[PDB]
DNA sequence: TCGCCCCCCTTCGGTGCTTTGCACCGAAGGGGGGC
């Protein structure tokens, strides 16, 4: 096969990201995986004259108890030339988000049969570490389309489409979307009857080279105001402050007839009776908040942003937007793993599910604003990751001024 | 000899040319020491003579070795380094003796003139040009270039290490039941073979090394305990650090104190209870390395405490994979923490300390979490797994922390240990307003261009207060207003502010801060019995908040 | 008058915030240690 010429973006160099420490079991797995990949020619041993590096680690599902090597090409993908610029990106089908079930398949191994431009290979270097630093790091670079590189789906696009078209025509009401190393396949059948054809798909895919998602049960959680017949000064204050925040989102919301019952330097526990011209304001705004917001449309030319808040007792609220206060989606994630303790595992699972919904809905992941210290997240998150992709994220400390979302 | 290994190709950074730097003077003993090796390196083929169309030069000198009778040669390649390509360094960390398992037979070897046995890429040699001076006014110097990796070049360590790794690779795979720790040119070789077969395998290793051009001189071939290795002494059952000698001075300078703190940090890996907070405090605000700093009373005490710890002998033990790792932490005060890692009681694998202040405002629970994370990372590096923890914090304390703290946080499997002083939350904000408690509507206003401000409050029971503030900020007057409300209220108080800044700090329940104003607020939160802290938006005419803002004008 | 690596403690300067200082963070200065 002939290599497609690839370039980094103008004025950018390759990734220079240090490897982080790995447990004994992940090091053994990476060494087992890469020595076999070296033999089959998919990667080659390199030295330190290659000045580039990207972190590697490994994930193992109990969805399937084999280790999977995961190279965090997030930096490399950021610096790689756009492929929608050069007529080779993959269009997202707006039908996928409406199908009964969508199963996700890991098809990254198909990339390993297409050679990568040798001039670009040096940017794909990674380094396996050493327990107690018994040895120097061992370095490799890819010779084929790497898993996790955003260029691999683009270069492989024409091949995969011909691998799929028999399945596409024999089953025309199934919609398949390739994202990174993944296939998102959905249609409207019984769970048994959906598992029918995904496995027919697997064996056609095996002929040449985990969870069942259900988009309809992705309830949107609106802004809910409390309910009771007796209100204290503090209850009204927190309410007036919550609606004042929601005035930056929704439209025509008033607090004038709620603010001035608080007139005076009242005690926080004093029970203020509602006027008729206050209960008027509240029940009026109560439903401006019932059905969601007018005039907010997805723009594929901009990034998706996701914000998560911890709510306690296993619950996590999230908003996905592109410009602030113009939310495309707001939701609430829940957990019941049976251990009932780990906040970091919960948030890691919350990010994967939110990122998966964005792929299903819009075709790409959002950049996450995580409610966690950088160093607490980096200490534990890889122990719970189970996607073959990794979204962008940053770390925030936003004290809950309003907790409108609960 | 020179290795028949293939050279590693190297490049200059794009756009740049080689160095051009004239030579400087040197002594009797450091020109014979070089000519002795320069004409000798040439006979061994380490360097070749060049001449004038090589336009490059780089100055040369020498330095003593712990050999002492031997001399080491170094060339000031600082400018060639700046113009040489970047390298990805393969030394990812430093091996530690606590990560070693007990071995029945142990050997430690070194390679002789290790850099000088790895060839240098042909096309790059002309950039390593230098000139040997010969007491300087004597003669114009002779010009040489390197054919092997020079000491002082940026690329030599990484290219050596990778070269050593390729050479050891056949021996490692053929002998997987032999542990070889490879640190630069130093080889630790342990096995479970009886000493007869062990020395067989060693001689096999040495012979393989020599075919590839690496000598192993007898001088550096340790065959018997104690083994000197990486700054430690390896015994059969235990390991020690080589003696740590601390400075003792009448008058300390900044640099002296910098030296002292470094020795104590190095000592803390096996000496439990080492502290450096009060001694490092002296380094703050100082503006010269030569500046004489008098020790504070607290620093002398801390120094004397550390000297008593180092007077007693200590040892680590080796790793037993058949038993769990256990990490135990103790609180020491002023944000300092020490720990010990072990598998059986009273036999430490190693110790350590954590004493960083992350952020302007924090509490003991946060720092304890950061100590656990540092230990957890160290454990992955040395043993490949995290340990079980024994923490001086009660389960109710931790449970209260992660339910009322809005960021996600976690600690692994841990068991409570009662080693006072315990880690506790020093106060808790009430979740709901307090019946009977007075209500304070606080506000603080500053003017950004003035530097002058006001902080104050009004009250549902009837108190008002305004205090003028000079050389303040917007955020300070808001903290100042909360400070006054805590100052003038009883043991229970409801407070309403309009600063998300101030609320955010206080709601995190800090017990220490770099700000004396926040520390004053913290001391008062601890003295209270019940505090409720609520927020409202400013400038919306909300009763209470409106009239106090009306007053701070 | 040199090189590479890890660690700790302090200082400095860039970044984003519905900011006007503040908190966070990475880099660089100093020290320890290894070869
Ligand atoms: N490889 C290797 C060795 C081992 O250094 P080592 O003490 O073992 O001495 P040696 O091997 O040269 O010769 P020997 O074993 O005594 O017969 C080094 C690191 F690991 C290098 N290195 C040591 N100190 C220094 C130093 O300050 N400046 C520079 N620029 N480089 C140094 C050179 C040497 O090559």
Numbering used by the authors:
A (entry chain B): 5 to 213, 231 to 427
B (entry chain A): 1 to 553
Mind quoting what the paper says about this structure?
In our previous studies, we examined various combinations of amino acid substitutions in motifs A–E and found that the HBV-RT-associated 3MB mutant comprising Q151M in motif B and Y115F/F116Y in motif A is useful as a surrogate for structurally studying HBV RT since HIV-1 harboring RT3MB turned out to be highly sensitive against typical anti-HBV NAs, ETV, and 3TC. The present study aimed to elucidate the mechanism of potent antiviral activity of E-CFCP against wild-type and drug-resistant HBV using HIV-1 with HBV-associated mutations in RT.
We also determined the crystal structures of HIV-1 RT3MB and RT3MB/L74V (4M) in complex with DNA and E-CFCP-TP. As a result, the structures of HIV-1 RT3MB and -RT4M complexed with DNA:E-CFCP-TP were determined at resolutions of 2.62 and 2.70 Å, respectively. The asymmetric unit of RT3MB/4M crystals contains two HIV-1 RT p66-p51 heterodimers complexed with DNA (chains ABE and CDF). The clear electron density map enabled us to construct a complete atomic model of the bound E-CFCP-TP at the HIV-1 RT3MB/4M N-site in both chains A and C. Nevertheless, the average B-values of the final refined E-CFCP-TP model were relatively high (100–110 Å2) compared with those of polypeptide chains and DNA close to the N-site (~ 75 Å2). The fluorine atom is located midway between the Met184 and Asp185 sidechains with interatomic distances of 3.5–4.0 Å; the fluoromethylene pushes the Met184 sidechain backward and fills the gap between the Met184 and Asp185 sidechains. The 4′-cyano exploits the deep hydrophobic pocket created by the Ala114, Phe115, Met184, Asp185, and Phe160 sidechains.
